[PDB]
Amino acid sequence: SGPEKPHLNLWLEAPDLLLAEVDLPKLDGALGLSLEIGENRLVMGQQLYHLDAYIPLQINSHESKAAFHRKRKQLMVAMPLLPVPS
Amino acid sequence: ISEKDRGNGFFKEGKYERAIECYTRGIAADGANALLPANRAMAYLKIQKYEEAEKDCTQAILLDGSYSKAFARRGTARTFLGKLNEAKQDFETVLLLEPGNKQAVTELSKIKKELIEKGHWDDVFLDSTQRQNVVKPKPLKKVIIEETG
Ligand SMILES: [Ca+2]
């Protein structure tokens, strides 16, 4: 047995806005859930679920936000993108 | 001699309140033309009359349901009035009538970010159209997880 890898949704809502949707049905409540975002990485960590993903985009970690939707059992992440090289 | 052309003259000269008079006279003499209310809404914006500009834009949209520039002016007006979700729906309409409109793409990012900052997650995530722009998957940063719904 062990923690399961959830289902992840990624898309570009805008050229500089990346949105995520993690499905956590067995989970309820944002307490006991940690989220870590790097420049090209997404870490979601109680040990019921765990998700270590690599994103092929430059993420603004400081201005990123997240929220756990209780009705739909989903973790929603909002990752603004860093300015691209000229 | 056109009352709209005369109003545009005052507008280039920055005389916004005098262009509104011409635009009003042109509206009262031709209620079917959608250029006049959109032009007067644009002059209203120049003098921070955002409430009055929204009505002049809706009037133009009722007349011409495809007037892209009318949605654009109502979009900025609705932002200053705080109606962010309604502003988002206007600029996304522009993006359908004028795919690639740069004012629309810019203001949509600025609006969808402020909507998430204020907590209206569903207004962005549920009403989203760009769900097909899929993205297939060094110190870390701890991001706190608020709640919603
Ligand atoms: Ca109509």
Side-chain angles (χ1 to χ4, degrees):
Chain A
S1 182
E4 186 184 350
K5 177 181 179 300
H7 172 254
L8 181 50
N9 292 327
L10 266 187
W11 73 88
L12 286 178
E13 190 61 29
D16 63 352
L17 182 61
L18 178 71
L19 298 189
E21 270 187 0
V22 194
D23 293 332
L24 310 175
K26 298 178 185 179
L27 213 289
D28 195 326
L31 178 59
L33 189 52
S34 64
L35 187 75
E36 300 171 286
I37 294 189
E39 200 165 332
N40 291 268
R41 197 181 177 176
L42 182 41
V43 174
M44 182 188 71
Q46 298 181 2
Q47 284 206 31
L48 297 176
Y49 286 100
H50 190 92
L51 184 57
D52 182 18
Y54 161 87
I55 317 300
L57 248 55
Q58 297 290 113
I59 302 174
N60 187 341
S61 60
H62 178 270
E63 294 184 35
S64 300
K65 300 185 49 177
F68 185 87
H69 201 274
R70 299 177 66 188
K71 171 91 172 185
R72 303 203 309 272
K73 299 168 178 299
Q74 289 183 349
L75 180 54
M76 297 178 297
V77 187
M79 290 160 296
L81 298 178
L82 283 180
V84 297
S86 291
Chain B
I1 5 177
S2 162
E3 197 78 23
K4 161 206 177 299
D5 290 334
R6 183 181 178 263
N8 291 9
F10 295 101
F11 189 75
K12 305 176 182 183
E13 308 180 2
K15 302 173 187 171
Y16 299 130
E17 290 179 342
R18 287 178 177 176
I20 295 171
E21 307 181 339
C22 310
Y23 292 154
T24 291
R25 292 206 289 180
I27 286 171
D30 188 10
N33 186 20
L35 276 178
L36 298 145
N39 286 19
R40 199 178 69 188
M42 186 54 172
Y44 275 137
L45 287 178
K46 292 292 180 180
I47 54 174
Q48 307 82 44
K49 283 184 176 290
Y50 308 107
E51 172 181 329
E52 294 89 326
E54 191 188 11
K55 298 164 191 167
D56 275 10
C57 281
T58 304
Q59 176 178 344
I61 299 179
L62 292 173
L63 298 175
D64 186 357
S66 291
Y67 199 2
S68 167
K69 289 287 175 293
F71 289 99
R73 303 190 170 93
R74 204 176 66 173
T76 77
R78 278 155 153 189
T79 52
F80 287 88
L81 298 167
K83 305 187 187 180
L84 291 195
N85 194 29
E86 297 194 354
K88 161 185 158 297
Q89 293 179 1
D90 276 3
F91 284 117
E92 267 180 345
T93 290
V94 170
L95 214 64
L96 298 188
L97 311 179
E98 288 185 46
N101 185 260
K102 292 313 176 58
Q103 185 200 22
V105 183
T106 289
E107 294 299 315
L108 274 180
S109 306
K110 197 171 77 184
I111 289 174
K112 295 179 186 181
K113 283 174 181 182
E114 245 264 312
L115 278 172
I116 289 172
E117 187 68 33
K118 296 189 169 179
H120 298 74
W121 292 83
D122 291 355
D123 291 336
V124 175
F125 278 69
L126 294 187
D127 304 333
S128 59
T129 318
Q130 305 291 336
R131 284 182 169 271
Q132 78 289 341
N133 300 5
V134 195
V135 177
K136 178 65 184 174
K138 298 179 179 180
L140 287 185
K141 169 63 170 56
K142 46 166 57 180
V143 173
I144 68 176
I145 303 90
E146 57 170 319
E147 289 198 332
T148 182

Short mmCIF file of all heavy atoms in Angstrom, two decimals, chain A residues 35 59 69 72:
data_model
loop_
_atom_site.label_atom_id
_atom_site.label_comp_id
_atom_site.label_asym_id
_atom_site.label_seq_id
_atom_site.Cartn_x
_atom_site.Cartn_y
_atom_site.Cartn_z
N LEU A 35 1.22 22.32 -0.17
CA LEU A 35 1.48 22.51 -1.58
C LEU A 35 2.77 23.29 -1.74
O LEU A 35 2.95 24.34 -1.12
CB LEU A 35 0.33 23.25 -2.27
CG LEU A 35 0.42 23.35 -3.79
CD1 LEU A 35 0.10 22.02 -4.44
CD2 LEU A 35 -0.49 24.45 -4.30
N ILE A 59 7.15 29.17 -13.79
CA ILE A 59 6.09 29.51 -12.85
C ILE A 59 6.57 30.59 -11.89
O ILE A 59 7.68 30.50 -11.35
CB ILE A 59 5.62 28.27 -12.07
CG1 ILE A 59 5.13 27.19 -13.03
CG2 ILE A 59 4.54 28.65 -11.07
CD1 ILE A 59 4.79 25.88 -12.36
N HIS A 69 -11.54 23.14 -2.98
CA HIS A 69 -12.99 23.23 -3.13
C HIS A 69 -13.63 22.04 -2.43
O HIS A 69 -13.33 20.89 -2.74
CB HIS A 69 -13.38 23.26 -4.61
CG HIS A 69 -14.74 23.83 -4.87
ND1 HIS A 69 -15.89 23.07 -4.81
CD2 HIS A 69 -15.13 25.08 -5.18
CE1 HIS A 69 -16.93 23.83 -5.08
NE2 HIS A 69 -16.50 25.06 -5.31
N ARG A 72 -16.67 20.05 -4.59
CA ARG A 72 -16.19 19.26 -5.72
C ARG A 72 -14.96 18.43 -5.39
O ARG A 72 -14.48 17.70 -6.26
CB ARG A 72 -15.90 20.16 -6.92
CG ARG A 72 -17.09 20.99 -7.38
CD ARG A 72 -16.97 21.41 -8.85
NE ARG A 72 -15.68 22.03 -9.16
CZ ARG A 72 -15.42 23.33 -9.03
NH1 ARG A 72 -16.35 24.16 -8.60
NH2 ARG A 72 -14.21 23.79 -9.34
#
